[PDB]
Every structure is written in structure tokens, then in C-alpha cells.
Design a protein around this nucleic acid. Sequence first.
RNA 1: AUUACUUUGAAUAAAAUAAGAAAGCGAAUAUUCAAGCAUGGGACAAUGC
RNA 2: AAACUGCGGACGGCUCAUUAUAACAGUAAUAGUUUCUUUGGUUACAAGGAUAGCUUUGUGAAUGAUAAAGAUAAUACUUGAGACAAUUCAUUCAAGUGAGUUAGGAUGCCACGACAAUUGAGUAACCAAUGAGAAUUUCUGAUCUAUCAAUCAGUUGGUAGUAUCGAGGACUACCAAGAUUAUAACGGAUAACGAGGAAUUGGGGUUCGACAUCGGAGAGGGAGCUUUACAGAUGGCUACCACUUCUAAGGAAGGCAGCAGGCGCGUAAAUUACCCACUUUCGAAUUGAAGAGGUAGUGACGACACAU
Lengths: 91, 86, 58, 136, 41, 98
Amino acid sequence: ARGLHAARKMLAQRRANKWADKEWKKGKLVTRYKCNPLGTASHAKGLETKQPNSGIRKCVRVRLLKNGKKITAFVPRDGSEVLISGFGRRG
Amino acid sequence: ARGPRHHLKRLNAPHHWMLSKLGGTFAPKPSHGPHGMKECLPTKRNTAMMIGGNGMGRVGVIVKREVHPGSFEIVHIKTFTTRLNN
Amino acid sequence: ITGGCDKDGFPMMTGVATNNRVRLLLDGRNGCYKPLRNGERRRKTVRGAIVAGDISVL
Amino acid sequence: EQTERAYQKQVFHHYHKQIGMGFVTPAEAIKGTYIDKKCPFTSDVSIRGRTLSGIVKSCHMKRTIIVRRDYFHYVSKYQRYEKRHKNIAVHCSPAFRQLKEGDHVVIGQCRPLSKTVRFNVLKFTSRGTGDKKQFA
Amino acid sequence: GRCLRNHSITYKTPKVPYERERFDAELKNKKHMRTIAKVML
Amino acid sequence: GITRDSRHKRRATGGKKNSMQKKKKNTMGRQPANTRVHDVRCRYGIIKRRALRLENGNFSWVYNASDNDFVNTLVKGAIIACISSRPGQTGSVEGYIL
RNA sequence: AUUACUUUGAAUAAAAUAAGAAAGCGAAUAUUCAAGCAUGGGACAAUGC
RNA sequence: AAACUGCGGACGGCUCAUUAUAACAGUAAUAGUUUCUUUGGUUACAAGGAUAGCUUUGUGAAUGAUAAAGAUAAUACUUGAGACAAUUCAUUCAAGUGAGUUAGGAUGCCACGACAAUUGAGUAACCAAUGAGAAUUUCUGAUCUAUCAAUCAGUUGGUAGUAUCGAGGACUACCAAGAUUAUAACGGAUAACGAGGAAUUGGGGUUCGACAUCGGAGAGGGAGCUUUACAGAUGGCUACCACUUCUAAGGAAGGCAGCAGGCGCGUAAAUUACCCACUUUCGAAUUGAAGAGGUAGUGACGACACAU
């Protein structure tokens, strides 16, 4: 629709098509409060690589105080209650 | 509000009182009497005088007075327009 | 009788006709309570006008 | 009209007044025998500031009809309008008898007369017949 | 809002962090009306 | 007790309103003291003469239009002559000869 | 014939925005839309006649 | 000084749990209501008694604990006269306003009934303003959702009463079958108080707004009330639910989402400071009081200038 009086559809059309947006939908439906281990928070106090790279990544498993779920966390540096704050990529 | 208000805020005070915005948190509340809170003080805002709208502070003489039975009536003065109460 | 206090300090009433501590929504019209504001009623406890051994002094 | 438990009577008993800004009292109001306490012309109810219009959607209610208003709502983002409607219940005095569904009526705002009724019919214009001659 | 007193920023960092043609030209430290002209033109 | 606001009624479409506050004193209702004379301290300090029961009445020159059950409560428009005052409000019965 | 549209006005809390070292204090200071009121116009439109 | 009496504590301050056409913003009405304060106007040389502080007896551990007795005043409470004002009702004459059997006059009735029996200024009733104000209400405007499509029975209207400061199903009795919905009704979700605004933007827009100011709502949860001019008040009361505290073990109080401050929570947030000197408010008033407010303390949240 393009006519001057068809403002109902295009407003309605856009609302439907927004749900296809992966980034936009993730921030509106209820998973940031039940599926995100961090919830909406920044940090969280708590208690082998892919094919072409060889070695061992030292890691840690942590149980969160609030939720209680267990997550795997990396150790920062070489030879390196715990505060955990994500990675470069969001989620 | 449970009852009539007594205090007055600096920001909420009428504009033409020329009160600053940092002098003090409160402004003096005008007591009830012969003149209203916004029509008193406790062109910078027959021949007539404008006391109301944009024409406040203007003197001049009326040309004609349209009347609309619905809402109000308009006064035109030597030319600017405004309601009767001004 | 003109009045008196109980062994626990509570006064004895005059209208009340019992012998046990009775909790009443008292007011200033019968002495045993002095209002702080105006028109304030407190459910104080008092004792009946009939004398007893609990009356610490008459 | 005395078909109820009380002796119905007028408001100023000794009557017809006239509404204000450029209106005409209908003929049926004076000669009509109807007793209406909420009639604008033969009672103590007046017409204040607001004044609307519309078409009549329903004429089933006793001494009351439903006016439909259609307008537009400009929406900023798309620079376009959308059709919208609003229905308001208007009290209609028996001074209008030919009034039927689909007619165009000028209404005025009066005091609260019911939970929903707050307006009074002032001047009506009939339209073409919508196959059902439904009147008050 | 949070405070009645006004405030402002007196500078703006560049969009591109590293560009040689800007490092030399700019080289104590490295810390309006054109559009106003524009709007009336 | 008795409130007179429209926060507990439904909408014209049948919707159920949702509570956002509590009962406020400006919507006070009062128990209807049927006139088969007290005074009530209304708002702003004015007084309402609440006639509990009364038999005499001034008049100027057996049936209740609203509720037959009332037939000997005294209300406006009641036939006894037709009462024209509001006895429960004014505190006296004033009527006219039919 | 109304309405839409359009032009002007009226009327329009301050703070803030922009405007007549960050600040501070009398700007014509202009807003600030969605409605609503008055007005000149009737080309493009919708509603019945 | 105290006490009686009077006024205020219904403003101020905090918070955002509620709440989805509800509240809120703008606009319109109140010919449908209206006080408090303030301002303008009108309408018997003095009478009668009791009461606190006062004194006396006490009581229990004690609350902002209360009991007895004997006095003494009022601008406390009354009666009482110098002589009207406004309410209800029935009838009638009738000029502003866009518009009124309207303000108003007249007739008869009821109701109420003065200008302190005041003090070195004080008081009653009514009219008007303050009042664009308070409160109700007119029109337009809100986020996501159909894995919410049919919804409502005081429901929608009519009559007559009641109740209300007052309109109105606000409520009661009788009568009718009506109201809304695909132009999204009804219902669901929010980590939803709304607006003025903020962040970012070429134009267009997207996201945020508990939080300076305006309006709303709340004081652990409901509910019911008192006093008054204003409260469904909670730094007022009453009862239940859930807690907190003192106890001589008989009993007793309390409501930090005021200012500081402690815990718990969490990634995440300051002094158990001083003073009414600014601004303002309340008071029997130029004085008193104010964790409102100002000053000082902590304070790489941020902003401006600026050493090396």
C-alpha cells in the first residue's frame, strides 16, 4: 500500500516484520531474564581448541550465587568468589 | 493533594516575576485577596490596555469587535487582536 | 465507692459492671484516658466498678 | 405519556425555551404532548461549549440514539492518515420523530445525563433510506 | 534530570582514531557558526 | 463505607476496570435513614437535618411510584397529598394537596 | 452543506533546546506536536443533494 | 513559665509498588458542585453555672500511664437583647447571557436566627472575590501481543425515589433489550507512574524519562473510622494477617518508601556533622520552629580551565 490513507497497514506491516530481526527480537522477548546467565547485568560474582589450533585452554567452572547455574569461564592471562564478565562478542 | 497548597517552587513561579532559577528553592506565595496568584505580584510583559495575552503592555484604540456565540469574543485594537479579558 | 486503682495500676471504671480487666475503646468522657490530639480514641483496658480484692487501694 | 407509576410533569410548570447559538426550536417540541425532563428545549438542561456531529448508528434505545463519528489520524512517521471512528451516546428528545438511522445530526454537550449519555440532539438532517426505517 | 546548573562539552574527539594525514597536521596536548551561516543560506 | 465513584463499575464495552488507588473520602456515601430528626455533619461543615421519623407536616394548596414495598416510608413524590420536599435531607415533610 | 487541505491569528508553566571557559542573569527571545477556537481561499479530494 | 482555650501538624519531605483510555498532556464546561485563609460589602451597669494548671491522697515496672478530693477564670460552655440575614415548600410578576419560569420582586408557610454579656483588636449569618483554584467532566492522543475473536447482566437505556458538596446506575424498585467488536472489542505481558524532557542524529527517525518542575498514587498487607474547612491521614486511631521491641511475667508500643546510620541484596551507590545566616513556610507572630533550607564531610559518576 502507498496511498495517503493507508497508514494502518504500513504501520502494521512494520510491526510484524520487526520480529524477524535477530538482534532486535533478542532484546524484547523474555530470555534476558531467564536464559541469560548474567541476566541483564554486566559482571557476575560466583564461586582443546578448534581444528587448526592445537593445545589446551585452561578454564574454570563456576556456580553463580543468585541463579545457581553452572558456567564455564576462561582464565585471562598466561600462567593465570570470582567476578566474570563476558567476552568480546556479546552473548 | 489532601488540601490546598501553601509552598511555592522557584521554577513554578510566574515568569514575569523575573525570579532567577538559582536564587532559592522556593518563591513567596501570594496570599489570597483582591488579585490572583498569576495576576499580581507579592510591552515586555475608547483607548484600552492589554493585561492578558501576547499584547500585554500595549495601549491603543479599538477598531471593531467580532463576536462568536460559541466560545469567546475578539477585540481588534490599533493593529493587533486579542480577547476581551486582556 | 468513688474510684480506685487495681493491683496492676489500672483504674476502676464507674459505668462498667464487671470484675475483670476489660479492653474498652475509651475516650476522655470517662477519665481513664487523656487524648493527645482531639477526637482520638484508644482501646485502653480498665476494670469494672464493682469492688474486689484486686483493688490495690480505694 | 402517563404510562408509568408517577404523574409525569414538566420542569417549569405554570413551557418552551430556545437553545442558544443559531438554533431553531423544532415544531414538534411545542405542540408535542411528550413530557421529557432531559429535552433541551422543554426543560432546564442547556447546551454548553462543545458541539459535534455524526451519523446515527442505532435507534433502538428508548429516547436515546448512538452517533458515529469518523475522522482521520495523521501519523508522523509515514506522513499518512488512517480512518478511525468513535461512538457516543446522545439523548434525543421526542421533538424529533422522523429521525432514523443513517441521518446526520448536530449535537451539543450538556450535563452528565447517564453513565454514557452527555449530549443532546439539536438539529437533524435526514438521508437516504438504509432499507430499515428504525426510529426512536 | 539531575541538576539545575547547566553544563557543556567544549570539544569533540574525531571519528577516525588513526589517520596519518591528521596525526601530522595536528602535530600542551591535543585537547558552530558555519552551520548557522548555512541555515540562512 | 459506601462509595459513589465509578472505579468499580464496568465500561461501555464491558471491560473490568483495574484498581489504581484506594477509596477516597470525596466519594462518601451514607446509609439511607428511611423516614418512617437527626443532624449529619456533611462536608464543608454544613449540616443536614436527617429526619429519622416524623408524622406532622406543612402542606400547601398509600402509593409509592418507585417501590410498593415502601407503602409507610416518607420520600419525595410519595402519596399520603403528594410530598414535595426531601424529608431525609431537609428534615421536614412539605407537601401539596393533589 | 459539512469535512479534509491550506493561510493567517488567538490562546499557549517554568526549567531545558537553540538563541540576543563550563557558568550566572530579563532577549521581539521562537518553539512544542497531536487535538480544539476564529479567519482569507476552493485547485486536488470524501461525505448526500 | 505551666495550664485552659486558639491555630497548625491535610503544607512541607520521601518513594514509584500499583495503574493499558485508567492516570497524564493540551483544549472545553461547570446554566452540575465548593469551603479554609485573605480581601471588599451587608445584616443589659453584663446573666448563669465547672474546669485544668493550683493544693491533697495515691496507684503500677513503665508508656506521651492513670485514679480521689477541695477551690478559680474565659474570646472554653450556655442563657439572655439591643430589632434582620439565609434554607425548604406552593403559587405568581419578570431584564444578563449564544442560551434559563435565570439573578431578582410578591404572596403564605415552615425551618435557622445574629453583628461575643469579648479584649488592650475580637465575633456570628449572608453576598462577592481570591477561584483560571479544588473536584467532576467534554474532545484527541499510549508500548508488545490473535499461540487473546467474540465480550458485558447494573450490563446499555427509561421512570421514580435514595445518597452525595453536587451531575450521574453512584444505589434501590419497576420497565425495556440493549452496549462493544476486525477502524482489533474482551483478554494477556511489561524488568509501565505519565508529561515537560534526555542520548544520538544530513533529512527522516531509534532508544531512554524512578529520579530538579507539573499531575497521580502509597506509607509492611487489606479494611473500618475519628477530628476538621480540607484525610479514607497512617511521624492519628480500631480489628485481622505478618513482623519489631520493653517486661518486675501482671502487662506494655511500634511502623525510616523523612535525615543521618546498621543489616540483607547485589556488579552497582556518601556523614549516625553544624546552624536557622540565604529561599520559604507554619504559629497566639517582626523574636519561636523547620534533617524544609543553607554550610561543612566523603565523592576519577560526569563537565570547564589548567602543572610536570
